[PDB]
Each structure stands twice: as C-alpha cells, then as structure tokens.
Design an enzyme around this catalytic site. Structure first.
Site: not given
Length: 240
Positions: A122, A179, A211
């Site tokens: 991330c 995502d 995500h």
C-alpha cells in the site's frame, strides 16, 4: 521452521527508531534480509505476522516504525485524518534514509549486506519502488499495490513513474484490477515508464482483487490472489 522474533531500536539519523524483526532460529551464517514496509497503519500486528511468515522462509525480516518522529497511527480512527495529519507529514527523503539505516543495522545483526531485499504494501508499496531507485546495493524489490502516479508535494515530490529511469534492482509489482485507488490506466503509464527506462520489472494484475488484497484481517482480502502473490514474491527473491 522455528523462528525467533523481537523488538529493537534501529539507530537512525541520530534517533532510535522502533522496529520488529524475525528470523530463522539456528541460522548457519549471515541471512538474506527483507525490509518490510508498512501500510499507513504502522507496524500493525498484521505486519509483524508478515515478518514472521518471511522468517519461516529463511529471511531476516525487519519492519521499521517509519512514522515515529511525526506521530502514532494508533491515535487516528479515520483514514482521512490519518492521511492529512500524519502520513502527509512524513517526507519521502526521510523514509528512504531510514530504510538505509535499517539495512546498516541489519548487516551487524545477522544479515548479509550483499543480500538486501525489500517488500512493502500500500503506502509501503510506493516506498518500495522509490527505494529501488535509491539504494544501488538493493538486490530486488516486491511492491504490493503502491500508488504509481500522483500529484506532487514537497513531502512527496516524485512518484514511481518519475524514478523508473533510476531503478537499480528488479521490481515485481502485485496489483489488483478492482483497485479504484490505482486505476489500470496508471499501471499503463508505469509500464510505459518502465519500457522507456528498459528497467527489469513487471507488474502482475489480479483480475479479482481490490486494494490491500493480502490483508488477511480485513474485508479486502482475496485469498487466491494473496497466496499467488506471496509465491510470486518468494520466487522473485529466490536467487538472492
């Protein structure tokens, strides 16, 4: 495979940065090192679990508390405020220098300086790309769903698309097709940047994944993609 884990300080730009570390128990000699870069949540239990999973594979895995000077992510209870008041105040230059200090500490605490690796998730997946263009000693990198393109700021003046040209190490990206925060057009922009750079890199896009698809404690977890990505990460690192 038995492991041993601990919390330590890492001496860093004059200050003591907390870090968690895990490694195999009866190691023969210096270990390959995987620096593990957090999401915006800091060195959460999930990140500690990942370090332990890497240690079961034979790595000295180290996750530094990169936000320590600016604040504690546990003091926020909504993502937007966490981003605004803490994440956006942590300068990229500081982060990359702290990762260098982790690598320095690792070489005197059971790691092999010639076998440095990094993976990150991330927020940490973007940092992963940046670090691969920063440390010429780095052997390989695996970035999970890190932002590729963005508007710039003084804290964060370059994005992965900008540094593809300066990449030092092979980078594998593991990205989710669903995502919304990292649209596929941006993956194309990054592929253009990597091709123009003739970089050794590839981005694998998982059709079913959002995500944070490796975050097994969260609703975004996609088991089939997470397990495949984990095996691709280990395959990418295997020779180093």
């Amino acid at each position: 495979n038995a492991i041993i884990a601990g919390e330590t300080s890492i001496p860093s730009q004059g200050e003591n940065m907390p870090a968690y570390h895990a490694r195999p128990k009866n190691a023969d000699g210096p270990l390959p090192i995987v620096i593990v870069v957090q999401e915006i949540f800091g060195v959460h239990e999930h990140i500690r679990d990942l370090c332990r999973r890497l240690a079961q594979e034979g790595y000295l895995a180290i996750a530094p508390e990169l936000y320590f000077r600016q604040g504690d992510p546990n003091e926020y209870h909504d993502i937007p405020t966490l981003f605004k008041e803490l994440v956006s105040k942590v300068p990229d230059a500081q982060v990359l220098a702290d990762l260098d200090h982790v690598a320095s500490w690792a070489a005197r605490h059971g790691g092999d300086a010639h076998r440095l690796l990094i993976t990150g998730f991330c927020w940490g997946g973007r940092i992963t790309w940046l670090y691969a263009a920063h440390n010429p000693q780095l052997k390989a990198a695996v970035a999970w769903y890190g932002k590729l393109v963005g508007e710039k700021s003084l804290n964060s003046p370059k994005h992965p698309v900008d540094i593809a040209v300066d990449l030092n190490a092979p980078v594998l990206g593991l990205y989710g097709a669903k995502d919304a925060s990292i649209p596929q057009d941006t993956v194309e922009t990054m592929r253009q940047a990597l091709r123009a750079a003739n970089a050794t890199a590839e981005i694998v896009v998982y059709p079913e994944a959002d995500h944070a698809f490796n975050a097994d404690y969260r609703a975004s977890y996609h088991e089939e993609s997470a397990k495949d990505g984990w095996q691709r990460m280990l395959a990418w690192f295997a020779q180093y």
